[PDB]
């Protein structure tokens, strides 16, 4: 970008003001922006919704198990986890 | 990933953990990642070098108007800018 250059240029200008040596300093090189990883162990974003089913709650069951419910409620959820915080609210 | 799916099950385990409701409830769909920019108005890592020139530092002088001195001193400079903080050290 033109304007991260021009930044580079600034920070240059303000090194030699805050500087107690007797001559200016200026750009020899601009070197590639030191890698910083990408997707790194913080919490990742997820959407998703769930259906009611016909099992009651207090089971030992896998909910992937229990049928969904004729008319049963939807809801859609948005939130985050970390893989190494979640609110739901009802569709219409 | 699988994890992250897997992630999204135990949340789901969760959900029916800290519910009042009557029913458990099952993964119906799973969403898109929500989108989230990148690139935003944070602070960009820079990486650089300057060299000592011939102008005595307490000049109104461009710093690119002024001749890079002969065996002038070498700085290797990394830190941060914000387009909307940096150290130096001496090469070898």
Same mark, same amino acid.
Request: hydrophobic content about 25%.
């Given at each position: /970008?033109?304007? %991260? @250059?021009?930044?580079? !240029?600034?920070?240059?200008?303000?090194?030699? =003001?805050?500087?107690?040596? /007797?001559?200016? %300093? @200026?750009?020899?090189? !601009?070197?590639?922006?030191?890698?910083?990883? =990408?997707d790194?162990?913080t919490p990742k974003p997820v959407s998703f919704?769930?259906?009611?089913?016909?099992?009651?709650?207090?089971?030992?069951?896998?909910?992937?198990?229990?049928?969904?419910?004729?008319?049963?409620?939807?809801?859609?959820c948005v939130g985050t986890v970390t893989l190494?915080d979640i609110?739901?609210?009802?569709?219409?």
């Open positions: /970008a033109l304007s %991260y @250059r021009e930044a580079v !240029l600034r920070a240059v200008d303000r090194l030699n =003001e805050q500087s107690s040596e /007797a001559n200016l %300093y @200026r750009l020899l090189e !601009l070197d590639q922006p030191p890698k910083a990883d =990408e790194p162990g919704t769930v259906k009611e089913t016909v099992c009651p709650r207090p089971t030992r069951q896998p909910p992937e198990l229990c049928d969904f419910k004729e008319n049963g409620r939807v809801k859609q190494d609110t739901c609210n009802e569709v219409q």
